[PDB]
Amino acid sequence: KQEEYVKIPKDRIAVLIGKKGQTKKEIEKRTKTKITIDSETGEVWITSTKETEDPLAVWKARDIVLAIGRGFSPERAFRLLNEGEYLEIINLTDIIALPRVRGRIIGRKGRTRQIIEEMSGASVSVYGKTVAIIGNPIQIEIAKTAIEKLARGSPHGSVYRYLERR
Name one GO molecular function term (predicted). Predict the structure, then answer.
C-alpha cells in the first residue's frame, strides 16, 4: 500500500484525463497504478495496486502527473518512465518581470528552448510561474544552468558557448 497526493492546475486536468479518460488510463497501464482525479480542485491521488512493481512506479506516475500539470504533453511526460530520468520543477521567481523571463528562456519562436533541449538532452516546459525539466541528473543540471543564465540576462552567445562546452 502507497499513496501520493498532488495538485495540478484546473487548466491541465482535461489533458491529464484526455479523450474519454484515454490518457489517465494510459498512465495507469504503463505504471500499474490507480490515478484518482478531482475535476473541481485539480487534486490527484496516485495509488499502488497489487500489480505495482515497486515504490518507484508510484513516484514515476506522480511525476508524470506533475509534468503534465506543469505544461508537458502526456507523450513528453512519459519520458519519465525511463530509468535514470527525473523531473525538476523550478519556480521562475527564484532564478531571477515574469513574461520577460519566459521570453528569455523560450526565445524568438521558441528557438532558444529548442537549443537548450538539443544541447542538454533534457526536455523543458515553460508554463506559468515555472520551468520544468525532464532528464537524467546531468542533463537536468546543464539545462537548469543555461536557463538560470538566460533568466539573469546572460547574452545568447555566452549561453550557447556554455552549452557547446557541456
Answer: RNA binding
- CATH code: domain 1-82 is 3.30.1370.10
Q: In one letter, which amino acid is 158? A: S
Residue 66, Cβ density class (10 Å: 0-12 exposed, 13-18 middle, ≥19 buried)? buried
Core vs surface per residue 96-124: b (16+ CB within 10 A) or e: eeeeebbebbbeeeeebbebbbebbebbb
CATH superfamily of 83-166: K Homology domain, type 1 (3.30.1370.10)
Technique used:
X-ray
What is d(CA 71, CA 16) in angstroms, rounded to the nearest whole number? 10
Domains 1-82 and 83-166 share a fold: yes
- Cβ atoms 86, 136 nearer than 8 A: yes
Query: Helix H segments across the chain?
Result: 10-17, 22-31, 55-69, 74-77, 98-106, 111-120, 137-151, 156-165
What resolution (Å)?
2.3
